[PDB]
Design an enzyme around this catalytic site. Structure first.
Site: not given
Ligand SMILES: [Cl-]
Ligand SMILES: [Cl-]
Ligand SMILES: [Cl-]
Ligand SMILES: [Cl-]
Ligand SMILES: [Cl-]
Ligand SMILES: [Cl-]
Ligand SMILES: [Cl-]
Ligand SMILES: [Cl-]
Ligand SMILES: [Cl-]
Ligand SMILES: [Cl-]
Ligand SMILES: [Cl-]
Ligand SMILES: [Cl-]
Ligand SMILES: [Cl-]
Ligand SMILES: [Cl-]
Ligand SMILES: [Cl-]
Ligand SMILES: [Cl-]
Ligand SMILES: [Cl-]
Ligand SMILES: [Cl-]
Ligand SMILES: [Cl-]
Ligand SMILES: [Cl-]
Ligand SMILES: [K+]
Ligand SMILES: [K+]
Ligand SMILES: [K+]
Ligand SMILES: [Mg+2]
Ligand SMILES: [Mg+2]
Ligand SMILES: [Mg+2]
Ligand SMILES: [Mg+2]
Ligand SMILES: [Mg+2]
Ligand SMILES: [Mg+2]
Ligand SMILES: [Mg+2]
Lengths: 216, 213, 196, 123, 204, 220, 199, 202, 203, 196
Positions: I1
């Site tokens: 992410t």
């Molecule tokens: Cl992450």
């Protein structure tokens, strides 16, 4: 805390005639990463007392929250009694010991500085409830790098002026910046005197790199 | 994993005389290979007649001494008299045992006067096993101090030597000597020696300098 | 768990050993012999790990006998004890250590009776009496209590019996019979087994 | 849970609920005990006759253990509770002291159970 | 600890023109005493002795292998070994086993074979040498021994005073160690004689 | 242990404390930690004491063979290479942490040498359990091109910092000063620590110790 | 530690050494390992010093409450059972206690072994502690129910002594007690070094 | 550590920070991590200092001898191959992440990476060490084909400065080297010469 | 992410990649990691998806109720405090690295980081997630005080694109949101809309 | 290791148990009794972990006796076995499991003799004969070889003896004496210890 996350490095303190000075860089490291480069690791507790913290910054913020509320509560009474530096240091010792004893420490090492009734106060408390007083203190790598310098000066001259103590602290911060890989060249100095608690910053040390050309 | 203990150094000694007790300690507080402070005595006044020496983990030394202080006041309130040296010892045994499964990491030696005014020493392990002794060393340099006391106070291994009572003057000289000897060899024992002498007149204090390395 | 005992009088060494070979919860032999004749006046008594015990003792035995053949006379008990020790010690830190505990009993023409104790680490001690095995914990104090240096052989066999009766009474293992031998100027004599 | 103070003092130092409990005892069937030289006898007024009764099921003389028994007068359902409490206690005693109870020990136990039910809320 | 499996204690001490070396007598295996006359001090010369504490098997091996090397040395050189040279020989022997050491920490005491100057030293298990001018200790009660030596030793003691000091230092030290004692042997080394004594000692 | 070195205007100053410990007990109060390599090269040692002793002895001996052969004064770089190549081969199992200094035909040189075989050539260095205390003194006070006496002052101050702030360090300060024209092996340089007096006397008279057996063996 | 006890015609002999150790360090040679529970009951200390002393002190408290409530002295059986029941709840938590409870009640001389593993057994003779194997050898060869009083003293004394000789963890002084019908008495305290000169 | 090298038309630029750490103690704050292997061939070293010093010394020896035997200047590709052979062969006993860069008359300026494990790849520019993580974005956004020598030195100094700010294991001074047919030019950026990018205050 | 937020005069810009992985399997390639907490307050989520969804849902509940009681729009600092309280209290049982960003009438556009462990700090801009490591340098070199909304959106998209190229655990599309007194404006950059920076292939 | 054995004939159940209490390498008692009288016609024989064995058996004993006092008659052997099993099973996954292995022997007026086996897991099996302990490994096949369902009590005691003699011959542990009892319609009878 079982596993510290964002952490601060050394905190220094030294007594001087009429007060106490403490210093701490403005870095929250995340392992080796210099992640949060503008955080204060010093708190004004009340007019006579200040605190600086090494270790887990989230746990320091919690202590700041609790302690700040305790002083507000006391001030609401308007009854002529205030927590002395020594009382705050006692409370902190108990709070750290208690959390240690539940196997859930607050992951911090702290330096409390104060001035009350003509006496300078300087006290240490660690995450296990080890606590004591001394004319100078240095947590973390400061214990190895700054404390020898503080003690050497204090042996020659136990009573320092404010300016002498301040210059000594700046020398130590420089050494720490050269030799602690978790340090940062942006710091605060906080002073407590008769007049109260003053926090100065952001400060930087001048550095010398002449040795770079002295390999041979 | 978190360890709730650390070793902070410290040597303690108590000696019982006919009408005195001595409790002595060095004043170094250590951790790892470092000195926290050179001025941290390990002796605590409990009453006019009783002093305790405490070494080991400083977090526990501080908590335990504060608990004892509260308990002495509670006792005085409920019973209308100060706790005797013996009663303090018996109580301390129970306080230590209350933590049998998460011990106070503290070696304790009590020195004081008994109810006839005679010197009394009680020594403890961390979970509160205890007994009365004539003399006892505890903490970091205890193995260094104890044999010389056995020899010089107990007269052990000596032939054709009169077993005289121990004067205060000789007890003090022995105390200073064994600490100076310990400071040469135990890395943790140093800075200064603090001596408390308990007699009927009260508690008096001497300090002697030790090596700072 | 195997038991060895030796008791040295003025002109003799008495030795005994249990006769059990056990495996797991069973005795697999009840007439086992833990003594090895090294020479006319030397016994080696050997206990410890299976394989190591016989391999070690028989190696020592063959080398002691070889010395006799090469030289026309025997190693003394002391020389034999030091030879044994050298080998065990030399193997301690090798790829082939021997996990064995030993007594060596002997009679020398000029030095008289000798009893040597050795552990698997190869520490060697001369002793007036000694014992190996868990049974030693229950019997050594009986020996300390009743022994003397001038103890006659009739009295020594009684003292031995008290040790063995103590094992029957107090030791948790079933050791019902023991080999018994005595060494003197006239060589190695078999005595009756002591049996319960 | 129901915590009303049931047994309380009245103005002349009386505990009326205890006195009323005593009235319940006085309406019970008569029970007699005599201690002999080497015998002890209990006798009780049956409560009824009633020819259609199974006699076995209403005895007012009860073994607490092998060496102790009791009779009672008053509320039979209450007696059954006290009896079975005492029976449990006789077995605890044997368990922890490895002797049977004295008559006095179990009497004392029963008496303190009764005293507690004069001084505890809700009962 | 490997070093405490057999227990034991050795010490040496310097006097005016004399040295002393002492040892306990116990051979034991963990808690169990096996004999009370176990030799821990070995002659390496008329006026030069080595005391070894630690694992009994290695006490014996090091003494024997050292004697092998010393006998060859003396035959080849046609002289008695100097104390400092014996130290070096022992250091070399121990360091050969740097990565699987002998578990013994020797003390040496003697007088120079030509000048009679006193010498004492100790070595760690891998052969690091330490020479001193007062005393050296090795064993399971080193702390107890340091305490007695620090308090009692004085410079330039005559042989009688040296004997009493080393004796009192050993007896009182081992009496605070469960796994050392069962007797004490003391050798006093002088220019013109060796005096060997066993001490009246606790046997528990 | 605290050991240290600096390059000054005309040479090298090396320094060391004199404590050796076994566990947390002082075994030697007067250990020599500044080892001879050649007449112009010395080496302070920290780490495992038998390894520092035997390693410095070996290299010194090999360097002597070298200089006997060359007829020339040895070079500091040569000691450095020999040490590091040996330490590397042993993969850190030889526990020698060294400060190597000398003066050769190319002038003064100072190296730190670590057990795994890394080396750093620097104007000041520290090693041992007191090394941070000593390094603090250097960072605060080192200047290039110091005079001999200033350099000696600085090194002794650095060693003293380790002595007083590290439980692993103690007793005396030794220095070794090396220049083109001179070698001053200063053992001790300073003795900041001293045993206190004995207040009692425990001089036990003849017969105090009970004796069980005695044998006198007269010698020639 | 070495402790022993045995029943015989004239009561119960109880004996112990006086050494405490912390690793190989001798921490004391003056430990009182025969615990005076009350005037008619003795206990013994082996294993953990604090554990024995604390739990036997609690035993003493409970025996006294018993005496007050019941108007008679608790039996040896019942006292040993109270102790067993107290420690049972702590099994697995690392208590270390091996004790002999010694008295004389309506069943005569009484002797029970009780420990932190949960054992509670009556018997004629016991020995407990690191030196117990050595004491058993000597006691077992000399023991009889019909030993005269002085012969029983000598046996107890010699068995402890011999244990102190072989067991590194036993030593100091041999302390000897005798439980009689009207209470226990302290018989003797003899330093091992003085016993050596004698035997 | 942070290390980097970058190719231009006629040569290469190399750079490194100067921090050597044991744990979080800075044992050398002025480390020279750019090691000459021959007249116009350098390596940048990261990972274990013992390992990289040992391997660099050994390759210097091998390449020197090779070059005398051939009587020609060595190829940069040969230097890299020698590093690769040793780093691959001994991959289970080394912690070494190397950049080899230099100039030779046959192929001009060249940069090779020999990361841990001992693969070898030629690249337009290479980064490595603990601090390289923090500058992948920056180098990917900033790199332009056809940079001059003076532009490449700026790019390297900037990248290293950014890494050094963020990586606790990197810092001190920036050592730079430019290599071309004319030779080697070394310099140090220290203090205020190190490119500065504000902390995002307020 | 990779997650990010950036302050401007009058609001904030938030962005995230869209990749959710289990090991190195992409279980969701179009994840929405920007979660609304109130009208003008969002959080950007990194770490355990279970943890951050659970915490975000709880804070949304707490803040909604608070806002009805006070009859006023909530403060961004209150949202961040609520996340902090939960993330700190349960720090041993959560793996959550959050950025809270939004607008309120009292303090305008604000960005708070609540990293793992539960500290809280206001920042001019914040980055987090596994891919943030690779863009510290870029953001440090590129950030300028006084950036406009349209400049902040470009900055965010560029930073996220760089992180996504390098981080195996980041990728997919770039989700962006701008928050101001006027409202919330959401958009997606996909395929050729994602800023592109050449691979440095050899001359 | 403790040994228990039971043999059920037509109208009786014969049980025996060793009389040793051991600790480490010593027997600390040689007249130990492993049998607990639950009622006039029930014995519970219990072995296992120290503390657990007595605490469990005595809890069961008190509760069986309580049932008798509350109800005026005794639990049957079967009911007593199931009560015992319920308690052991209920504790198995609690904070207070009991590590005990059991036999329960009884006689019921209407059902005759019964022998039940239980292990520490609280599996309950009725059996014509059974044994616990390492000694069971050496004796069960003897029972399988010689038992019959109509075995008389005078033969059953001989069969028991053969099992005990096998332990003396072959088992590595010293178990020299055994308690022996028989239950029938007339209650529990003590027989002579079987001793070696
Ligand atoms: Cl992450
Ligand atoms: Cl920040
Ligand atoms: Cl503040
Ligand atoms: Cl009963
Ligand atoms: Cl050899
Ligand atoms: Cl080099
Ligand atoms: Cl060191
Ligand atoms: Cl005593
Ligand atoms: Cl009671
Ligand atoms: Cl019993
Ligand atoms: Cl014990
Ligand atoms: Cl006797
Ligand atoms: Cl390097
Ligand atoms: Cl790499
Ligand atoms: Cl790399
Ligand atoms: Cl790196
Ligand atoms: Cl740096
Ligand atoms: Cl994706
Ligand atoms: Cl985070
Ligand atoms: Cl994050
Ligand atoms: K000291
Ligand atoms: K940095
Ligand atoms: K990606
Ligand atoms: Mg020091
Ligand atoms: Mg093998
Ligand atoms: Mg001893
Ligand atoms: Mg002993
Ligand atoms: Mg390596
Ligand atoms: Mg979770
Ligand atoms: Mg259990």
């Amino acid at each position: 805390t079982q596993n510290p996350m964002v952490t601060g490095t050394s905190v220094l303190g030294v007594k001087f005639e009429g007060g106490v000075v403490i210093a701490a860089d403005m870095l929250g490291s995340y392992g080796s990463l210099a992640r949060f480069r503008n955080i204060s690791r010093i708190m004004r507790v009340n007019n006579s007392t200040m605190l600086g913290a090494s270790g887990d910054y989230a746990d320091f913020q919690y202590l700041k929250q609790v302690l700040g509320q305790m002083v507000i509560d006391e001030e609401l009474l308007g009854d002529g009694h205030s927590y002395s530096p020594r009382a705050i240091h006692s409370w902190l010792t108990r709070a750290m010991y208690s959390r240690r004893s539940k196997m859930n420490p607050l992951w911090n090492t702290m330096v409390i500085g104060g001035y009350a009734d003509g006496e300078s106060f300087l006290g240490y408390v660690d995450m296990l409830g080890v606590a004591y007083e001394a004319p100078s203190l240095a947590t973390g790598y400061g214990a190895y790098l700054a404390q020898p310098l503080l003690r050497e000066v204090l042996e020659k001259q136990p009573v320092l002026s404010q300016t002498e103590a301040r210059d000594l602290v700046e020398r130590c911060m420089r050494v720490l910046y050269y030799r602690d890989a978790r340090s940062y060249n942006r710091f605060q100095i906080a002073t407590v005197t008769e007049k109260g608690v003053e926090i100065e910053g952001p400060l930087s040390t001048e550095t010398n790199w002449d040795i770079a050309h002295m390999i041979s | 994993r978190f360890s709730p203990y650390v070793f902070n150094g410290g040597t303690i000694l108590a000696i019982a005389g006919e009408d005195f007790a001595i409790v002595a300690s060095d004043t170094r507080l250590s951790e790892g290979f470092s000195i926290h402070t050179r001025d941290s005595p390990k002796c605590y006044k409990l009453t006019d007649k009783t002093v305790i020496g405490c070494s080991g983990f400083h977090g526990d030394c501080l908590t335990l001494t504060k608990i004892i202080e509260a308990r002495l006041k509670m006792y005085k309130h409920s019973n209308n008299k100060a706790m005797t040296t013996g009663a303090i010892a018996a109580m301390l045994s129970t306080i230590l045992y209350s933590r049998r499964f998460f011990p106070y990491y503290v070696y304790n030696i009590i020195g004081g006067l008994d109810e006839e005014g005679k010197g009394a020493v009680y020594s403890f392990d961390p979970v509160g096993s205890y007994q009365r002794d004539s003399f006892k060393a505890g903490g970091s340099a205890s193995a260094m101090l104890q044999p010389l006391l056995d020899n010089q106070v107990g007269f052990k291994n000596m032939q054709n030597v009169e077993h005289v009572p121990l004067s205060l003057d000789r007890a003090m000289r022995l105390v200073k000597d064994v600490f100076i000897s310990a400071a040469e060899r135990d890395v943790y024992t140093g800075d200064a020696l603090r001596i408390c002498i308990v007699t009927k007149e009260g508690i008096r204090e001497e300090t002697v300098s030790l090596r700072k390395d | 768990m195997e038991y060895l005992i030796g008791i040295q009088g003025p002109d003799y060494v008495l030795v005994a050993s249990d006769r059990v070979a056990a495996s797991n919860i069973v005795q697999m032999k009840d007439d086992h012999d833990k003594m090895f004749k090294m020479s006319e006046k030397i016994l080696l008594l050997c206990v410890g790990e299976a394989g190591d015990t016989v391999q070690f003792a028989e190696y020592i035995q063959k080398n002691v006998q070889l010395y006799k053949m090469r030289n026309g006379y025997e190693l003394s008990p002391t020389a034999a004890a030091n030879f044994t020790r050298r080998n065990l010690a030399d193997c301690l830190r090798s790829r082939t250590p021997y996990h064995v505990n030993l007594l060596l009993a002997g009679y020398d023409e000029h030095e008289g009776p000798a009893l040597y104790y050795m552990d698997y680490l190869a520490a060697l001690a001369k002793a007036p009496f000694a014992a190996h095995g868990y049974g030693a914990f229950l019997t050594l104090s009986i020996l300390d209590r009743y022994y003397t240096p001038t103890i006659s052989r009739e009295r020594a066999v009684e003292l031995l019996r008290k040790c063995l009766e103590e094992l029957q009474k107090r030791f948790i293992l079933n050791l019902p019979t023991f080999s018994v031998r005595i060494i003197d100027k006239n060589g190695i004599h078999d005595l009756d087994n002591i049996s319960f | 849970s129901y915590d009303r103070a049931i047994t309380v003092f009245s103005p002349d130092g009386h505990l009326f609920q205890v006195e009323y409990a005593q009235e319940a005892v006085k309406k019970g069937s008569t029970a007699v005990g005599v201690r002999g030289r080497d015998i002890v006898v209990l006798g009780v007024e049956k409560k009824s006759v009633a020819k259609l009764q199974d006699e076995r099921t209403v005895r007012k003389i009860c073994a607490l253990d092998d060496n102790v028994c009791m009779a009672f007068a008053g509320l039979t359902a209450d007696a059954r509770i006290v009896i079975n409490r005492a029976r449990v206690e006789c077995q605890s005693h044997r368990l922890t002291v490895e002797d049977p109870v004295t008559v006095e020990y179990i009497t004392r136990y029963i008496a303190s159970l009764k005293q507690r039910y004069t001084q505890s809320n809700g009962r | 600890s490997i070093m405490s499996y057999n227990g034991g204690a050795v010490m040496a001490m310097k006097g005016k023109n004399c040295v002393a070396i002492a040892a306990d007598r116990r051979f034991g295996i963990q808690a169990q005493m096996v004999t009370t006359d176990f030799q821990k001090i070995f002659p390496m010369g008329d006026r030069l002795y080595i005391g070894l504490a630690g694992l009994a098997t290695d006490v014996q091996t090091v003494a024997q292998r050292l004697k092998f090397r010393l006998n060859l040395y003396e035959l080849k050189e046609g002289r008695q070994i100097k104390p400092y040279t014996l130290m070096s020989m022992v250091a070399n022997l121990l360091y050969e086993k740097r990565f699987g050491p002998y578990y013994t920490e020797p003390v040496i005491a003697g007088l120079d074979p030509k000048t009679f100057k006193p010498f004492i030293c100790s070595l760690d298990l891998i052969g690091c040498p330490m020479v001193t001018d007062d005393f050296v200790v090795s064993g399971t009660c080193a702390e107890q021994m340091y305490g007695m030596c620090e308090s009692l030793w004085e410079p330039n003691m005559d042989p009688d005073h040296l004997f009493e000091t080393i004796s009192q230092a050993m007896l009182n030290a081992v009496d605070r160690d469960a796994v050392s004692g069962m007797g004490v042997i003391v050798h006093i080394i002088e220019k013109d004689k060796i005096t060997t004594r066993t001490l009246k000692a606790r046997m528990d | 242990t605290t050991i240290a070195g600096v390059v000054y205007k005309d040479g090298i100053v090396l320094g060391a404390d004199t404590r050796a410990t076994e566990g947390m007990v002082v075994a030697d109060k007067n250990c020599s930690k500044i080892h001879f390599i050649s007449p112009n090269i010395y080496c302070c040692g920290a780490g495992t004491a038998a390894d520092t002793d035997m390693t410095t002895q070996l290299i010194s001996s090999n360097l002597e063979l070298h200089s006997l052969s060359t007829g020339r004064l040895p070079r500091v770089v040569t000691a450095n290479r020999m040490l590091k190549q040996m330490l590397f081969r042993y993969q850190g199992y030889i526990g020698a942490a060294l400060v190597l200094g000398g003066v050769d035909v190319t002038g003064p040189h100072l190296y730190s040498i670590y057990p795994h075989g890394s080396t750093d050539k620097l104007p000041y260095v520290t090693m041992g359990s007191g090394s941070l205390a000593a390094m603090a003194v250097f960072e605060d006070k080192f200047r290039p091109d110091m005079e001999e006496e200033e350099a000696k002052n600085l090194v002794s101050e650095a060693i003293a910092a380790g002595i007083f702030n590290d439980l692993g360090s103690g007793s005396n300060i030794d220095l070794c000063v090396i220049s083109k024209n001179k070698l001053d092996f200063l053992r001790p340089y300073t003795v900041p620590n001293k045993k206190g007096t004995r207040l009692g006397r425990y001089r036990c008279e003849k017969g105090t110790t009970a004796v069980l057996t005695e044998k006198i063996t007269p010698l020639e | 530690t070495t402790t022993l006890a045995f029943k015989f015609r004239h009561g119960v002999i109880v004996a112990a050494d006086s050494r405490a150790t912390a690793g190989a360090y001798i921490a004391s040679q003056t430990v009182k390992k025969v615990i005076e529970i009350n005037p008619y009951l003795l206990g013994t200390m082996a294993g953990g010093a604090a554990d024995c002393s604390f739990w036997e002190r609690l035993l003493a408290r409970q025996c006294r409450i018993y005496e007050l409530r019941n108007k008679e002295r608790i039996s040896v059986a019942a006292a040993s059972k109270l102790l067993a029941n107290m420690v049972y709840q702590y099994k697995g938590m690392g208590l270390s206690m091996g004790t002999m409870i010694c008295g004389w009640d309506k069943r005569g001389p009484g002797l029970y072994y009780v420990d932190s593993e949960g054992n509670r057994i009556s018997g004629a003779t016991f020995s407990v502690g690191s030196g117990s194997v050595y004491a058993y050898g000597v006691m077992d060869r000399g023991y009889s129910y019909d030993l005269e009083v002085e012969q029983a003293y000598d046996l107890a004394r010699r068995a402890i002594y011999q244990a102190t000789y072989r067991d590194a963890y036993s030593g100091g002084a041999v302390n000897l007690y005798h439980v009689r019908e009207d209470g226990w008495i302290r018989v003797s305290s003899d330093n091992v070094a003085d016993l050596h000169e004698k035997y | 550590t942070t290390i980097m090298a970058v190719q231009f038309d006629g040569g290469v630029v190399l750079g490194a920070d100067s921090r050597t750490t044991t744990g979080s103690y800075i044992a050398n704050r002025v480390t020279d991590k750019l090691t000459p292997i021959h007249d116009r061939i350098f390596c940048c070293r990261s990972g274990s200092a013992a390992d990289t010093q040992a391997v660099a010394d050994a390759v210097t020896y091998q390449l020197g001898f090779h070059s005398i035997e051939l009587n020609e200047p060595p190829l940069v590709h040969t230097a890299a191959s020698l590093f690769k052979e040793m780093c691959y062969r001994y991959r289970e006993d080394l912690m070494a992440g190397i950049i080899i860069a230099g100039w030779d008359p046959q192929e001009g300026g060249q940069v090779y990476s020999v990361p841990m494990g001992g693969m070898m790849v030629r690249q337009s520019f290479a980064i490595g060490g603990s601090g390289s993580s923090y500058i992948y974005g920056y180098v990917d956004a900033t790199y332009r084909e056809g940079m001059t020598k003076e532009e490449c030195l700026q790019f390297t100094a900037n990248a290293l400065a950014l890494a050094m700010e963020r990586d606790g294991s990197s810092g001190g001074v920036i050592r730079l080297a430019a290599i071309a047919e004319s030779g080697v030019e070394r310099q140090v950026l220290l203090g205020d010469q190190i490119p500065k990018f504000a902390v995002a205050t307020l």
